[PDB]
């Protein structure tokens, strides 16, 4: 499982524990990411920010 990091240049493979990819963006522009990292348990979303999780390579 290899996804992109905060910077759309360097990639890292989620180590043992995390097998999902998390992405943080504003509930307005889905084509406009903000942060990107790995995660284990998909957190909850808010009315402001939204954390979409996916179980695919280079999803976030």
UniProtKB/Swiss-Prot annotation:
What keywords is this UniProt entry annotated with? Answer: Cardiotoxin, Cytolysis, Disulfide bond, Membrane, Secreted, Target cell membrane, Target membrane, Toxin
Q: Where are the transmembrane segments?
A: none
> What Gene Ontology biological process does one annotation of this record name?
killing of cells of another organism
Q: Where are the annotated coiled coils located?
A: none
List the subcellular locations: Secreted; Target cell membrane
Which InterPro entries does the entry link to?
Cytotoxin_Cobra, Snake_3FTx, Snake_toxin-like_sf, Snake_toxin_con_site, Toxin_cobra-type
Main localization, broad class: secreted
Gene Ontology terms, MF aspect: toxin activity
**In this record, what's one Pfam family?**
Toxin_cobra-type
Cysteines engaged in disulfide bonds, as pairs = 3-21, 14-38, 42-53, 54-59
GO CC field: extracellular region; membrane; other organism cell membrane
**Tissue spec:** Expressed by the venom gland.
Family, similarity comment: Belongs to the three-finger toxin family. Short-chain subfamily. Type IA cytotoxin sub-subfamily.
Q: What is this protein's function per UniProt?
A: This three-finger cytotoxin is a basic protein that interacts and penetrates into the cell membrane, with the tips of all the three loops. Cytotoxins which have a Pro-30 (P-type) interacts with membrane stronger that those which have a 'Ser-28' (S-type). CTII interacts with membrane stronger than CTI.
Quaternary structure, from the entry: Monomer in solution; Homodimer and oligomer in the presence of negatively charged lipids forming a pore with a size ranging between 20 and 30 Angstroms.
Q: What is this protein called?
A: Cytotoxin 2
Organism name = Naja oxiana (Central Asian cobra)
